[PDB]
Write a protein that binds this ligand. Structure first.
Ligand SMILES: Nc1nc2c(ncn2[C@@H]2O[C@H](COP(=O)(O)OP(=O)(O)OP(=O)(O)O)[C@@H](O)[C@H]2O)c(=O)[nH]1
Ligand SMILES: Nc1ncnc2c1ncn2[C@@H]1O[C@H](COP(=O)(O)OP(=O)(O)CP(=O)(O)O)[C@@H](O)[C@H]1O
Ligand SMILES: Nc1nc2c(ncn2[C@@H]2O[C@H](COP(=O)(O)OP(=O)(O)O)[C@@H](O)[C@H]2O)c(=O)[nH]1
Ligand SMILES: CNC(=O)c1ccc(S(N)(=O)=O)cc1
Ligand SMILES: [Ca+2]
Ligand SMILES: [Ca+2]
Ligand SMILES: [Ca+2]
Ligand SMILES: [Mg+2]
Ligand SMILES: [Mg+2]
Ligand SMILES: [Mg+2]
Lengths: 53, 438, 350, 422
């Protein structure tokens, strides 16, 4: 039962009590987005082509 | 002094953000027009509240906040609300049609054509920061914007702000206040793409906040206002160290050092008390040993789980009110002799305690009653993985039949990103078990 | 109309509760994966407790106390007793035991040999027994070299305890036996003891000069009906009940079953459950738990009771399925989902 | 401001769609001239979803009336709220369709579809943000069925990423104008399966049996049946017309109701249907789910619910609403698929319909709808096996090959509903 790192100020105080010792770059993100945009455009095309038929 | 920027995404994040900043102003003595009489330094100063508020020559204290919703209905409430004067239009961004509860639609479809705008509006606040600390990101798991667009926003912030910290306040999906069948899909999709980009995440299960409102406040059917007023109280206690003089959790970097030894396990469990109904004429004011004791009952955990059948990796106690360290230790001792607090063998068995003398401020007219002392405990327990096991389970039930998958594939997302995200959660549950079970 | 699910097809005890539940016309059974249920008869190993108590407007009940494995596992029960102050290493009703990990994997090897070398030096009875949870695999021997050599031949955790060299023998026959008491714990943590126990007796004369033949030493219902040549001779199915056993105790030893034995059993159950209550209680939990336990006791020639092991998924004696099961529904299930005592309450402090 | 464009085509479509605008215009405080005379601000909160705001504070519905003969639409222009519609939005011919899908889809309808779309574009070009379109029509006729589907096929071409919602009326031999209605229905069904997101199946047979038995009406009329459609349509649109958070728009609704693209045919229902008695929230639910309050003429106990969307209207204990809904799920969970958690959502609306203390509307994506396409396909094959009545169509340019294809496009639709019921 030890109390360490005791700090006190006007607005309060804090301390510790011990009981027992013991990414994607900006390029790849644009490609991920343009890749999903391409997959939406391709699907919208197949739809229209189906309607044109 | 170092600044902190708060980002609110989606409906849940914006309304909750509206409740926190409302509370922040009542605590720091900031009026709706942004005036602070107690602030003697006019137009400047590196005080502790200046981490969340900048000052203009006219004396207005402006929150370092940025709201972002893909549909204007929810944010328009803030533009004409009570605290409309605090913000300026730049801080509020709105699209014209939302994501329809579709992660793929919030991340790819609608996200691609508004991300460079949000970043540009955030870049404007960072410029006002002499020494920016990091970001606080509020949002929801089930919402298409709170989930799809947030994971994307996080990915970019790590690119434009590599060395800055990013903390999350996520809303866990709860069917009692949710109107979306695919919210499991969104939660698992966003937690996958956001994991490596979030340094510390506080998960708040609406199901948890819901029952606390019906049990402690006698609200038979709570509204979002009832839920946000409470979530802000918790958030206020967790962020108070950044806004008030002190030495525990004085900047975002200490939230990881003090709560996340293992990076992937960065979801601390929260617990708050006391929650007393203001309708009660008067209530017997609880002591330190009684409020501290409550921190180990499942009834006031932001996520319903059983810490007894887990293991702790860290633990903080945030007191507010008439509390002295003498009574804190006394409570802790008597709690160890009665409770089941199993720590991992590679972490110390201790508690970092912080005490703010100002008692928790209550929203005039709100539901919570004024108490003289209160505490919020942050505990990194392996028990919180139960929430993942539940969510991961529902994900398996729907994806096994590919139900609703076409709405995501239709927005351009790849079906493989589902299993790639699921396999990630499976590894997250495995790490939770490697740490807690024998 | 209540609803329940079933996930342990091999559970014989609850296979009758489900049958009785349906006989009331007020309980509907669902598929083993329908989460909208009132009562779960869950699986033994790896029961998903984390998913219980999250269905809005549904009170859920499960028939296993999360954390009971601390009491029903061989190695677990030992560490629990030595470490728990409520029991202490000085407990008088639990045989001196030690946890021994096989040398291919804390461990109490040396502390076991110390107490062993102290006995061999004191001329006291020094016959031990080894066993594990991964058994149907037991070895009785008086040589510490044999016991340690047998555990290393395995690959799971084992335990060595003092073999009771002086067990109470029934007459006629000169045979060993054990006592099985069924204890039910409801959601309020009330501890009910089934007034009806059973004595799984051995049909072979106890022989203390030959531990190699384990037919007169082990009193399991499957061993006596397999390797014993006098099965069913004295009593039916090698199961004597608290009536026949209570008469014999009065004709021979001039005492009752209640005083000599039943009192100690009611104290062992109290102290075992009260100990782990803070760890498994579901008082303020989102769901509720209740579990049936099967305690196994030994009685020595001094009429002192010892605790062998606890069963978290025990089976009941043939002649006591109807009465007990109905009791489970009255005090454990219907006590939570009322419809439109054969137990002995063991009062305690919560 | 998310706008919806309404379209009603054909005799049945316009009569039905007409009463609809009469029903909601009264709930929103709009008089026959388009002026507002309500007393609650909720009536105007989401008003611009279905109404365009003109000069002098006038509210002009965003509707387009389409038919191939002036007979029906002339009645609309002379009806109660006939003077409220946009005079230009009346697009009609004179030849008529003669209950012939081919004429509505290939010959007569083709000569008028370019003109109907030009008005659709006019309304959309004024929409700040357009959610999608909603169509009212029958499937047994010629105009609404043949041309109606022709419109959708083209509307989806010019607005590929907008929600196409429809109110389709299924024909029944108990209420049939012609013997060829099975042909017309089967043809349109395959078009709805392809180019629509949400289709409210409304079987006249159910509407009939409801009027005969539950409503005790001796001899029903199309007008009687249209009160049910009016009431039904009033409720299913409440999510979109008033302030709410659940199913607030069409795309969100589609996302929470359609787990698979080709299974978007809903079974609607409401309640209530000795009239001055106050109806308790329990009774609203007990009836709301009973098959006799559903306009699909299908026994849900013969199938399973994929999703359900209940909307409650009127000042009531919203706590008592949750309790009761959670009682129907927990006492009949064997009829809800267990591989879709919480597939039942509940929304509350404070503004009740007319003159009712409280009401409840049912929206169900049930596999029992296959029983409906079974009757249609049975009645189709009964004639197509002998080529009976095919000359009315082969004479319009169609081939038996196109019939065989539609016949099989639906048999596939049934098998699809059948593999999920198991
Ligand atoms: N606690 C709390 N939860 C909220 C609040 N608003 C929404 N939620 C939860 O958020 C989840 C859905 O996310 P939303 O924020 O509403 O959706 P979104 O972020 O606007 O994204 P979209 O799909 O485009 O609308 C639901 O499960 C709600 O329970 C709120 O104000 N407080
Ligand atoms: N220390 C000891 N002294 C005497 N006998 C002992 C003993 N330890 C075990 N036994 C014998 O072993 C039997 C209990 O074995 P154990 O309970 O470890 O295996 P098990 O769990 O598979 C049987 P159960 O069906 O009761 O669970 C008893 O019949 C008892 O006679
Ligand atoms: N419920 C209802 N059904 C109708 C109405 N008018 C026609 N029908 C049905 O629609 C089918 C005929 O379609 P019809 O209206 O003639 O199509 P149109 O040629 O486009 O006008 C028949 O099966 C009728 O039963 C109506 O007012 N109400
Ligand atoms: C044959 N005389 C008609 O006037 C006539 C008869 C039938 C049709 S139909 N029903 O469209 O096939 C059209 C017109
Ligand atoms: Ca200042
Ligand atoms: Ca990072
Ligand atoms: Ca012509
Ligand atoms: Mg939203
Ligand atoms: Mg055993
Ligand atoms: Mg007609």
């Amino acid at each position: 039962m030890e109390v360490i790192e005791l700090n006190k100020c006007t607005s309060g105080q804090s301390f510790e009590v011990i009981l027992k010792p013991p990414d994607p770059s900006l390029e790849e993100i644009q490609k991920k987005l343009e890749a999903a945009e391409e997959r939406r455009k391709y699907q919208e095309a197949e739809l229209l082509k189906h309607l044109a038929e | 002094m170092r600044e902190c920027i708060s980002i609110h995404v989606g409906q849940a994040g914006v309304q909750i953000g509206n409740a926190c900043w409302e509370l922040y102003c009542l605590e720091h003595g900031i009026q709706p027009d942004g005036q602070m009489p107690s602030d003697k330094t006019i137009g400047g100063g590196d005080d502790s509240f200046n981490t969340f508020f900048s000052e203009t020559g006219a004396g207005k204290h402006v929150p370092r906040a940025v709201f972002v919703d893909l549909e204007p209905t929810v944010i328009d409430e803030v533009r004409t609300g009570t605290y409309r004067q605090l913000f300026h239009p730049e801080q509020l961004i709105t699209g014209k049609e939302d994501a329809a509860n579709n992660y793929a639609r919030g991340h790819y479809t609608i996200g691609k054509e508004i991300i460079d705008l949000v970043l540009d509006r955030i870049r404007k606040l960072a410029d006002q920061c002499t020494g920016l600390q990091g970001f606080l990101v509020f949002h929801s798991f089930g919402g298409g914007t709170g989930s799809g667009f947030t994971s994307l926003l996080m990915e970019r912030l790590s690119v434009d702000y590599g060395k800055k910290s990013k903390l999350e306040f996520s809303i866990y999906p709860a069917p009692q206040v949710s109107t979306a069948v695919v919210e499991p899909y969104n939660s698992i999709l966003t937690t996958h793409t956001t994991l490596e980009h979030s340094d510390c995440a506080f998960m708040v299960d609406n199901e948890a906040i819901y029952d606390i409102c019906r049990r402690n406040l006698d609200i038979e059917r709570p509204t979002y206002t009832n839920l946000n007023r409470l979530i802000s109280q918790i958030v206020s206690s967790i962020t108070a160290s950044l806004r008030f003089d002190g030495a525990l959790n004085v900047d975002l970097t200490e939230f990881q050092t003090n709560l996340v030894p293992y990076p992937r396990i960065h979801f601390p469990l929260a617990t708050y008390a006391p929650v007393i109904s203001a309708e009660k004429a008067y209530h017997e004011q609880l002591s330190v040993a009684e409020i501290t004791n409550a921190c180990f009952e499942p009834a006031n955990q932001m996520v319903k789980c059983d810490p007894r059948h887990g293991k702790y990796m860290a633990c903080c106690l945030l007191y507010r009110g008439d509390v002295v360290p003498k009574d804190v230790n006394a409570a802790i001792a008597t709690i160890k002799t009665k409770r089941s607090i199993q720590f991992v063998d590679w972490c110390p068995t201790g508690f970092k305690v912080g005490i703010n003398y100002q008692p928790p401020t209550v929203v005039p007219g709100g539901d919570l009653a004024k108490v003289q002392r209160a505490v919020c405990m942050l505990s990194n327990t392996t028990a919180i993985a139960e929430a993942w096991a539940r969510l991961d389970h529902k994900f398996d039930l729907m994806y096994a039949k590919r139900a609703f998958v076409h709405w995501y594939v239709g927005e351009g997302m790849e079906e493989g990103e589902f299993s790639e995200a699921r396999e990630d959660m499976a590894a997250l549950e495995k790490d939770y078990e490697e740490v807690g079970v024998d | 109309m209540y609803t329940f699910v079933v996930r342990d097809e091999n559970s014989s005890v609850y296979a009758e509760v489900s049958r009785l539940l349906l006989a009331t016309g007020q309980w509907k059974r669902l598929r083993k994966d329908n989460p909208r249920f009132n009562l779960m008869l869950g699986e033994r190993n790896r029961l998903p407790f984390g998913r219980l108590g999250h269905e809005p407007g549904l009170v859920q009940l499960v028939n296993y106390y999360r954390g009971a494995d601390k009491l029903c596992r061989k190695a677990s029960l030992v560490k629990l007793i030595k470490t728990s102050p409520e029991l202490s290493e000085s407990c008088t009703w639990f045989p001196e035991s030690y946890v021994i990990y096989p040398t291919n994997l804390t461990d109490e090897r040396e502390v076991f040999l110390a107490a062993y070398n102290r006995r061999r030096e004191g001329r006291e009875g020094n016959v031990w027994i080894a066993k594990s949870s991964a058994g149907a695999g037991i070895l009785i021997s008086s040589e510490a070299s044999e016991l340690l050599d047998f555990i290393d031949e395995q690959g799971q955790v084992h335990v060595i305890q003092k073999y009771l060299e002086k067990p109470l023998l029934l007459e006629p026959g000169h045979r060993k036996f054990d006592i099985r008491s069924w204890v039910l714990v409801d959601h309020l943590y009330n501890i009910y003891l089934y007034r009806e126990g059973v004595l799984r007796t051995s049909s072979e004369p106890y022989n203390s000069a030959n531990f190699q033949d384990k037919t007169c030493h082990l009193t399991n219902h499957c061993i006596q009906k397999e390797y014993s040549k006098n099965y069913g001779r004295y009593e039916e199915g090698n199961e004597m009940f608290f009536e026949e056993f209570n008469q014999y105790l009065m004709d021979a030893l001039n005492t009752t079953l209640e005083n000599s034995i039943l009192l100690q059993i009611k104290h062992i159950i109290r102290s075992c459950l009260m100990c782990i209550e803070p760890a498994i209680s579901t008082k303020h939990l989102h769901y509720q738990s209740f579990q049936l336990f099967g305690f196994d006791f030994m009685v020595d020639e001094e009429l002192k009771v010892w605790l062998i092991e606890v069963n978290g998924a025990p089976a009941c004696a043939q002649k006591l399925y109807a009465e007990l099961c109905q009791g489970i529904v009255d005090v454990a299930i219907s006590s939570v989902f009322p419809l439109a005592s054969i137990f002995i309450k063991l009062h305690h402090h919560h | 401001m998310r706008e919806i464009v309404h379209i009603q085509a054909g005799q049945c479509g316009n009569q039905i769609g007409a009463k609809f605008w009469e029903v909601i215009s009264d709930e929103h405080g709009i008089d026959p001239t388009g002026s507002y005379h309500g007393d609650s601000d909720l009536q105007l909160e989401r008003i611009n979803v279905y109404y365009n705001e003109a000069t002098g504070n006038k509210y002009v519905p965003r509707a387009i009336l389409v038919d191939l003969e002036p007979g029906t639409m002339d009645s609309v222009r002379s009806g109660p709220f006939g003077q409220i519609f946009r005079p230009d939005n009346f697009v009609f011919g004179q030849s008529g369709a003669g209950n012939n899908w081919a004429k509505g889809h290939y010959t007569e309808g083709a000569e008028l579809v370019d003109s109907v779309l030009d008005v659709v574009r006019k309304e959309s070009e004024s929409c700040d943000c357009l959610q999608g379109f909603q169509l009212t029509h029958s499937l047994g006729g010629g105009t609404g069925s043949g041309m109606g589907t022709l419109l959708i096929s083209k509307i989806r071409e010019e607005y590929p990423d907008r929600i196409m919602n429809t109110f389709s009326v299924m024909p029944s031999p108990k209420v049939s104008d012609t013997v060829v209605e099975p042909y017309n229905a089967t043809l349109s069904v395959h078009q709805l399966v392809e180019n629509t997101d949400e289709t409210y199946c409304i079987d006249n047979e159910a509407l009939y049996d409801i009027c005969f038995r539950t409503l005790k009406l001796t001899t029903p009329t199309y007008g009687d049946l249209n009160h049910l459609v009016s009431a039904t349509m009033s409720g299913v649109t409440t999510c979109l017309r008033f302030p709410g958070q659940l199913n607030a728009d069409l795309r969100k609704l589609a996302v929470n109701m359609v787990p698979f693209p080709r299974l978007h045919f809903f079974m609607p229902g409401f309640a209530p249907l000795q009239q001055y008695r106050a109806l308790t929230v329990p009774e609203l639910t007990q009836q709301m789910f009973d098959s006799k309050n559903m306009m699909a003429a299908c026994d849900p106990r013969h199938g399973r619910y994929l999703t359900v969307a209940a909307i409650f209207r009127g000042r009531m204990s919203m706590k008592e609403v949750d309790e009761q809904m959670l009682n129907v799920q927990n006492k009949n969970s064997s009829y809800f698929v267990e591989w879709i958690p919480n597939n039942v959502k509940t929304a509350v609306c404070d503004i009740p319909p007319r003159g009712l203390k409280m009401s409840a509307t049912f929206i169900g994506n049930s596999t029992a709808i296959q029983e409906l396409f079974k009757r249609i396909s049975e009645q189709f094959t009964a004639m197509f096996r002998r080529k009976a009545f095919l000359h009315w169509y082969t004479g319009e340019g169609m081939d038996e090959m196109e019939f065989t294809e539609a016949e099989s496009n639906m048999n596939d639709l049934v098998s699809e509903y059948q593999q999920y019921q198991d």
